[PDB]
Each structure stands twice: as C-alpha cells, then as structure tokens.
Amino acid sequence: LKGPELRILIVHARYNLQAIEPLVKGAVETMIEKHDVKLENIDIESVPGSWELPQGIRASIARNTYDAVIGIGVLIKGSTMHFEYISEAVVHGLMRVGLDSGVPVILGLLTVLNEEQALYRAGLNGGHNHGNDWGSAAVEMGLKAL
Amino acid sequence: LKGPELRILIVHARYNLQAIEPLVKGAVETMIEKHDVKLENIDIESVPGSWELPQGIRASIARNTYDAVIGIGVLIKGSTMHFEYISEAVVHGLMRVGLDSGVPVILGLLTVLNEEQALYRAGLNGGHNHGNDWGSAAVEMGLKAL
Amino acid sequence: LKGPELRILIVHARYNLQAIEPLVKGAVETMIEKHDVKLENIDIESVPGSWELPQGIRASIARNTYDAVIGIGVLIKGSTMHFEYISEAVVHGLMRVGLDSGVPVILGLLTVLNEEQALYRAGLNGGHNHGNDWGSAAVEMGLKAL
Amino acid sequence: LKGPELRILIVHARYNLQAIEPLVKGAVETMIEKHDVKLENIDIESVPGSWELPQGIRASIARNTYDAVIGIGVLIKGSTMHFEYISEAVVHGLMRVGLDSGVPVILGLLTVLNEEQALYRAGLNGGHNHGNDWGSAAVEMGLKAL
C-alpha cells in the first residue's frame, strides 16, 4: 500500500523523550520507505504530555486537512493513581476526536509499568519498534478513508 | 428468522488472524445457511487492529447503507496495561457508533488472557464458534430495525 | 402509586433465560397487580444479548411512545474479561439512552459471578424477585415524568 | 456566603433511608441556618434508587429553574459487581447532567463498603454529617453561577 498523496499528522508528547524519539522515527521512516509517503506531507507537532494529546490533535485537525493522524505518548506507572486516570482519559479522548472528526486517529500510546517496557517497544534492547506498525496503520486508514 | 433483503457489513481487524478467520467464516456461513442472507449482500472490510474498528465502521456506515454491522477483533492480554485501555476504549467506541448511527452494531470482540482462549471461542480445540451467534444476532437486529 | 394510563416498554435479552423469565414475570405482575397498569399497555420486546439492550431500547423509543422502559439482562462472569467490558459498556449505554431521550430507563441488569446469584435475585431458592422492584420503579418514574 | 434568592433542588434516592434522611436534613438545615436560604425556595424530590438520580435531576431541570441541585444517594457494596457498575454509571451521569445543563450539580453520593460507613458519614456514631458540606457547596456554586 502506497500513499504518495497522503497528508499525515503526528502529534507526540515530550515526557519520556528517550522512548518517544525512536517511535516517531520508526513511524516516519516506515511511511516514507515502505509506503512512498512524502516527507513534505508529514507534519510533526508536539505537546507537553499525553494529557494534551487529544486537545493538540483536535486543534490541528481544525487548522489543516489530514488523511490520518498518529497520537504518540508514553505513560509510565508512578506511585499514585495518576497513571491509571490519565491513561483512561487520554484513550477515550483520542477515540472521541477520531469519531467526532471522521479523521482516522492511530493509537501510538504506550501505557507501561516501567521504562524498560517502553524502550523495548520502541525497538531498543532487542525489541520491535511499534512506531513502524503505527506508520503502516496510518497509511492504510488514510487510503481507506478516501 | 430469514433476511433475504438484509445488507450486512462485517469489519474485522487483522491481529491474531488465526482466530479471526474462523470467526468471520462462522458469521458468514450462519447468516447464509441459516438465515437466507445473500452472499452478494455481505460486505467484508478489514482494518489493522481493534482500535481501528469503531472508526472503520463509522466511515463505512457513512458510505453505504447497512441493516446491521458486526465488529470482529481479538485482543489478548500482554505485559503492559495496553490491553486494558484499548479494550475499554473500543467497547465504548462500538457502542457509541451504534447509538449515534441507529445502525445495530454486533459485538464480535474477544478480550482474552491468552491465545488458547481465543482459538477456543473461534470453534477450534473443541470450542464453539462464536461467530455463528454473531451472525444470527446481526440478522435478528437488522430485521427488528426495519 | 397507580398508572392506568402508563405505557411501559420492557426489552430483555435471551441469555440465561432461566433467570430472565422470572424477572420479566415479576416486573409485569407487580405493575399490573400493585399499580393498575394495563396488560395491553405493556410491550415486551427481546434481543439476543445484553449488548443489544441499549440499541434495542433506542430503536423502540423512536418507533412508539412510552412513559418508561425497563432493560433486563443477565451477565455472568466467564473465563475472560468479556464480562467486565460488556457490563461497563451496557450500563453506560442504558444511561445514555435514557438521558438522550428523556425517557426513564430502569436498570434490570444483573452482573453476577455465577448462575446461583442470578437465580437468587430472580426470586428462586429463597431469594427476592428484583423484577418486582423494577416494576414499581418504572411506574413511579413514568408518572413523575408526566 | 448567603443566598436569600437562591432556588435549590434536592433529589434523593430511597435506598438506605436510615442514611439518607440525616443527609438531606443536614443539607437543608445548613443552607437555611448558615446561608439564609429560604425554606420555600428548596424543592425536595425523590426517586427509587441512585440509578434514577441523573434522570430525576434532568427531568426537574427541564421543568423549573434552579441555581444548584444536590444529588443524594447511598450505594453499598453487595455480593455482585452491581455496586461497581451502578456507581460508575451514576457518577458519570451526574457529571453529564451538570455539564449539559450548565446547572451546578453537587455530588451527595456515598459509595461505601457497608452500612456503618454510610451512617458514619451521615453524622451518626461520632461521624460528621456530609450533607452539611453539600449544602454549603450548593449555595456557593449557585452564587458563582450568577
């Protein structure tokens, strides 16, 4: 599946940047190299934390036109219930924004127990980079939308 | 109950295809063989993962007209909280799409602890294929809708 | 409280019929015998499972006019997380349908760990039939709605 | 803070009346004695159970005009998952009704493990009556609304 005409938006948070960067890279590279997406057609915005993800995406969806958007963030369990509540709220938020707008929203949210799990799913320490999968999913949903 | 005039949509994810195929088959066969649904009147779309299910269904519901739709996906517990949050979000999502559109959405989502449980509910290893039940449910809700 | 003019709708699922029948009976009998509701004024629809409850109710609410509706279903914990997710989604769904329509929706949903608990709350094995309470609640909310 | 002109609505369920009455009293008395709210300006409706709370409040909010409303109910953990699902649904429902209507809805819902805990929070057995706090909150939000 190739989408030379696809316009993709990527909004990522900045918490746990060590895990986030590889994820964004994987997503971008895969779209470009495996799906012929054009670098100029990929916008990359960022927000402070995962909580801002739904809101950041919604604001951008109103500004420009995209065929698909990927929300990327990394939530790690802490000592409080903060993680549980934010996670639940962000996941529902992302789903709402996609259903409300009609624009496919790909879930690049990692909700892990600790750092190691995040890094692993970002392709480090022998793991598989999940951003790659998200890249392909974005392309696919973008096309099926047209 | 027979629905020769019913138009049914089936959207399934592609994760855990070993479990998904039998489910789709069961659903289709049952509708055709037990309810006189016409093969030509059954559309089968697919999406990457369960997360795309609500969005895929919504997009299609807008394109064409269906009497009922079946969302099929298989979520398996992993090492992180990913499973819990995606499950909760997809289930609420599917319910929303059905209530928003007025089109009956049948739940063919399996949320299991491991592969064996999925395969079992797909009719393998002595289990009962749940896709069959979903097929009948779709037909029934489609008729009651008219 | 008597509601001779009340029009009540009862939508019940068909899973765990052993527990469902007594519940419907209790609800109907109580409304008729204790509240003077007229048998002709009580519609009884059914759907495959609890998941279809919100959707079934919504469809009917659009067709005819009712003063109150009772959603009856029985969900039993199985081996997977299926029970937890369906339960949460159905409960939110029923609440939405009632708030969206302005029509009182009485919760006749049992979310139990096993069969015995269901049967018991259906008035068998020394238990109290909860359908009765639901019957009275429906009548009361219907009147307060007018 | 005094609100002589405030019109307050109180909707309470009837389950666990032993705990509910003290709560309503505390709320009413505090508003009157500490905030100069007029007895004639306080409406008190009731519903069967906590599930009817959101619906009861919504119906009344449409009938008359209020500056604030207090939802009072007592949910006690039983042997099934009933408590968990009803609790979650009612809390979300009350929040929705307030955000939808723009009318402040004060949470006078107790979600406890057993009777003792309820009675205690109702001011009995050495406890502090929480209805009092709700009374003050209602007055405060009602004023800030104007």
Added chain:
Amino acid sequence: LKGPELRILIVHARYNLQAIEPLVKGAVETMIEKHDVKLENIDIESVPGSWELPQGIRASIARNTYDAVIGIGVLIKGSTMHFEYISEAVVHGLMRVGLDSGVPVILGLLTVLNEEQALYRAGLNGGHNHGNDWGSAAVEMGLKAL
C-alpha cells in the same frame, strides 16, 4: 516560550489547601517569571472540591475568554470507594470541557494514596513542585492554540 498576551485561567478546589497553595503559587510564578505572562492576565477562581472543577471551568469559559485554563485539585484515597469514582468522573469531565470548548485544559489534579504524596508533588519535603510544569504547559498550549 513567552506569552505576554496570553490570558490564563486557574480554577482550584479548596480541599487539602496545604497542598493546593504551593501548586497555584508554582504555576503562577513560573508563567510570570519564565514565560513573561502578566499578573493582570491571570484569573484565579476557586471551588469547594474537585467535583466542582469541570463545572467551575465550564461556567468561566462561557463568561470570559482565555487561551488556556489549569484545573487544580487534590484527591486523597479515603476508606470508601468515593476517591475512585470522583477521580474517574473529574478526569473525564475536564477532558470533555476542553474538547467541547476548544480551550486547552491543563490537568493539575493529584490523585494520591495519602497526604505525604500530595505535599511531595507540591514541592515540599524534597519534592518537585508540579504546578511549575503545569504553568509551562498552559503557556505552551495557549500559544499553539493561536
């Protein structure tokens, strides 16, 4: 990032004031000192408890115009399930208000097991004041909104 023209709203609850004051201070000081936000351009409202947070914010969002709002509250686990249900409802409520209005809502909600954890995240006893981070997040989201 500097926002001399930004208008920021801060709504905080009054429960656990020992933890709330430092949080508000941190937020305000950071915006002013690190982002050139003007003291006159920062409104600070308050509400009784965290439950009133979404409602308070919504009311204010309707009155005036803000570029971003920060919701600050502290919920501590008690002996009942009260904490769990209020937390879930408030977090979803805040997300809704931001998505509904299009105005960025920063989450300054602490959901902790005990006081010590709250104080610690408020910058006391060797901890880092989280209000600071919230201040920067507000400024950032406010600008990206314009």
